[PDB]
Subunit: 260 residues, 4 copies
């Protein structure tokens, strides 16, 4: 249980981040959500976190590709919550192309969100955690923070960068009651992945589900998707006392991807 | 909760394994314990698992440096439990010396217990898990399955071997409902480590607790020990549904050791 | 021997890059050098590469923190050389501060040079190498592309990012006659490190050489610096036929840093 | 050049080890060879090392699955050579089967040769290298010392163990003029691999060369074999001055295997 804890989840209007916010709320944490989407859906998300799980929930819109907006977001989040115990740096994007064709603006956008926002969010959060002598920073990296695939230069670079940044954060705050770890998922069937399944299905002239199977077969030995719920469970474990001395490391939920 | 689950923990008469057995019993699992020690203490351990936590508990004595004894142990364990859902391959020993002075019999003993017993125990357990379509194999490796220190050739070799074996086990059983992962602790203050703290204290002419601090400072950035209870919590997480697609990987609870 | 080969070394007016350019020239390669410094020193460097080693050498000034300048540099380099066989992405900077004090502009500057320039330089070079069916891209990462230290968030993030980018580059160009690998040095006594030795010497109130010894003792088990000449040798090996099937990997010359 | 150096290569009657011995002899080293095979072929190998390359060469038969035989081999080798500068621990075997079907005797045989012989050979060599203040220990691990595949439990465990042992050796002898590193090949078309290509060809009902292509496609992005000659080149680089501060690490020549 995380009763009383104050959590922030970036990019929690969709996908993995939405499940993170849900699982933390179900554990008893008040939650700040963030991200893009339809305003009606976002407000329904916010209000149902409160009405289902009896916590406080706030939505703060911030484009975390902007450094100052990210730092201002963390301040506003901590003000809303009355503190900041758990930060989940989750927001991210993907774009696929070979390096020589990879758009410079897409490189910049992926580095800005998937890497730099993790730095800026961490930097803003840390003094709050340091003052109280407790904190969790949970970075959502990827299997692609540990290994590579073709046509994902920016994303692999960014995610490797997140794994490095995680280690530094941990070392700088070792023994302070603050841990920092990176959750490294394999394939999870969110909109980020559905776009790649569709692109495969076209390339190969197959139906969407045959394409999903081929995507899994190439990388993920279990031949099953990792679920957002599972990953929310992992974040809840990282937030627990059992994980007091788990810091600076990666937690891979990837169906065997990185074992081979 | 692991209500109804059937667990086996090797080397669970002391240290980390004793906490593993305790946490699994507290989660509702029936438990087979194993290891050396005073018979009066072992029977008190067994009986109090039952009387505290309302599960069944059995003690089976087996020297797991012997391959056939290890395989016979798993059979006897599964017969006692009426099945075998969770295997924790935990028993291990340590000996410190530079390579050219390292006793050949100690190399053999460390390889036999710390590596080969994990293979033989896994081999015996797997068909039971494969038939039922569910299982957890949880190998207790070390930070020394990922990095080295001086004067620990056999142990580092064995533990690296366990990390490799974990990956194979996972891959071979991917998608079958069976996962295999390695918990990689840093320093935990058990008798295995107390011997090294004492040897330091002599070498340096300091008291035992100053020696414990020096041991931590050299390797473990948090400057705190990992606890057996924490590691029992990690095993309980690995046994959970959230960890259905966590397989073939390492879970480091090491206070930052492997981050630097 | 690399007789006839056409090489480019970024940040080759100082330190490791200067030794890279020297060793490649000594092996018979024509060389484009790059970087900041005193014009008189740079021209002496250029002209003495030619007069000592009988190759052609060119200096192209480009601030590689600018993406378009980096891409324009590679074009100008290939035009000067009449081709482009070997690219050494070496230019880099360092800044030390804890995350919450780490200047946003320094984060941006380190990401731009130490990571993004590697992407932009690679992207520009690749089509030239792909057309000829041979190439070497040699990225100078660090031990800090594999592990972390305190107060080096941006640099560790960038260098981990370079290690990831290296892997992608390799995979995308597997079998094409092009390899991409990352050289990961430990401490090398260049101006980048002399600044840190000086900062230590002040912090600890010791002389510069006692500070150098303390810097080595903390991280580098050999207690010796890696030399620029050694690293130039490593680049010459990577450029050789023996390394035709060495791709996507790290070559650590670090006195044991990453072994522990 | 390694003129005057004294080298020992285990398992150098076939495959990678034969190329190791050849390249070291071509660099000017006297060489002790070792392994099984036809006596006429072995003597022709020995004598042609001498007649082609003008060095001394000796063949010492030792079954390195036996610890004392391994230690006695190193003594006899050093006596033949008049010293011992470079030790290449290369001899190894393979067997494929799922864990629950994996023969206990094959586990024991693979651990004994592929792991324990590396320990015993290292232990015997080290005092000779320590006394002279120079040495190279070059362990032939595998991609399977870093990652796993199915049906290779013993081999993956052993090779991970070699990677760990390499790190310890390096750390214990840091700064002494002795380095220890592990060469980690991908597929190399020796008899060890030809057996697996044949087993595939049967399983799939295809010709041998289509099977070789399928073997490469599954693991090795370059779609080319690594050659024994290349690996001999890598050993010659490790033996060079440029590699004085390369210690405790892995040198992967694997066509991209471990990048993904
Ligand atoms: N889906 C996978 O298979 C997978 C695997 C490994 C890691 N990841 C990582 O998981 C994280 C979540 O990804 P997902 O699959 O749930 O994707 P998703 O597209 O479902 O969700 C992305 C979330 O980030 C938000 N977002 C995007 N741009 C933003 C910006 N500039 N500022 C603030 N918010 C922004 C979106 O609105 C959304 O809430 C990402 O970091 C991704 O890299 C995903
Ligand atoms: N303590 C640490 O800091 C630490 C760190 C990393 C990993 N580990 C690993 O944790 C595991 C448990 O170690 P611990 O610190 O609790 O040590 P411990 O000495 O307290 O416990 C060892 C257990 O194994 C049993 N045992 C020993 N030899 C055996 C044999 N031949 N057959 C069956 N049982 C045997 C002992 O009786 C005891 O129950 C080991 O695998 C060890 O390598 C320990
Ligand atoms: N010295 C070490 O111990 C060490 C260890 C690991 C990795 N590295 C890496 O080695 C590489 C070289 O570092 P060094 O120690 O030789 O440092 P150095 O300061 O001696 O040399 C840096 C070189 O890069 C050039 N440079 C800097 N900013 C630039 C810009 N914007 N555009 C173009 N050129 C620029 C400099 O003019 C100089 O030629 C760097 O990538 C560094 O991260 C160094
Ligand atoms: N071929 C590959 O693709 C590949 C890939 C990675 C690593 N490796 C490793 O390379 C090394 C050499 O393998 P290879 O492919 O050249 O195989 P190989 O079968 O051609 O050669 C094996 C050598 O070891 C010798 N040998 C076997 N048993 C021995 C014993 N008990 N005592 C002494 N010598 C013994 C053999 O006689 C032979 O000289 C092995 O360690 C292997 O694990 C091979
Ligand atoms: C697996 C998935 C991710 O890493 O986000 C991908 O897009 O590669
Ligand atoms: C840390 C501890 C262990 O790995 O068991 C040790 O003995 O090194
Ligand atoms: C070792 C050195 C480097 O990585 O450049 C440092 O500044 O940490
Ligand atoms: C690649 C090869 C080896 O590792 O020896 C194999 O048998 O898997
Ligand atoms: Cl890929
Ligand atoms: Cl050490
Ligand atoms: Cl540090
Ligand atoms: Cl596999
Ligand atoms: Na709180
Ligand atoms: Na940003
Ligand atoms: Na059960
Ligand atoms: Na055994
Ligand atoms: Na390390
Ligand atoms: Na050329
Ligand atoms: Na740039
Ligand atoms: Na000699
Ligand atoms: Na042996
Ligand atoms: Na991999």
């Amino acid at each position: 249980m995380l009763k009383g804890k104050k959590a922030v989840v970036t990019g929690s209007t969709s996908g993995i981040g939405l499940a993170m916010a849900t699982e933390l709320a179900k554990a008893g944490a008040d939650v700040v959500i963030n991200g893009f989407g339809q305003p009606e859906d976002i407000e329904r998300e916010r209000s149902t976190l409160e009405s289902k799980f009896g916590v406080k929930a706030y939505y703060l819109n911030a484009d975390l590709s902007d450094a100052q907006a990210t730092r201002d977001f963390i301040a506003k989040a901590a003000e809303a919550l009355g503190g900041l115990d758990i930060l989940v740096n989750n927001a991210g994007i993907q774009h696929t192309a070979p390096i020589e064709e990879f758009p410079v603006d897409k490189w910049n956008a992926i580095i800005a969100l998937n890497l730099s926002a993790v730095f800026h969010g961490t930097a803003a959060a840390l003094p709050i955690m340091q003052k109280q002598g407790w904190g969790r920073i949970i970075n959502i990296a990827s299997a692609h923070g540990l290994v590579a695939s073709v046509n994902k230069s920016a994303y692999v670079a960014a995610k490797h960068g997140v794994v490095g940044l995680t280690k530094v954060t941990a070392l700088e705050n070792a023994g302070k009651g603050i841990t920092c770890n990176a959750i490294c998922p394999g394939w999870v069937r969110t909109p980020l992945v559905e776009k790649q399944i569709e692109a495969i299905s076209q390339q190969k002239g197959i139906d969407i589900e045959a394409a999903a199977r081929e995507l899994l077969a190439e990388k993920q030995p279990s031949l099953q998707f990792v679920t957002p719920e599972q990953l929310g469970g992992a974040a809840v474990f990282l937030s627990s006392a059992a994980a007091d001395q788990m810091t600076g490391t990666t937690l891979s939920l990837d169906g065997g991807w990185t074992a081979r």
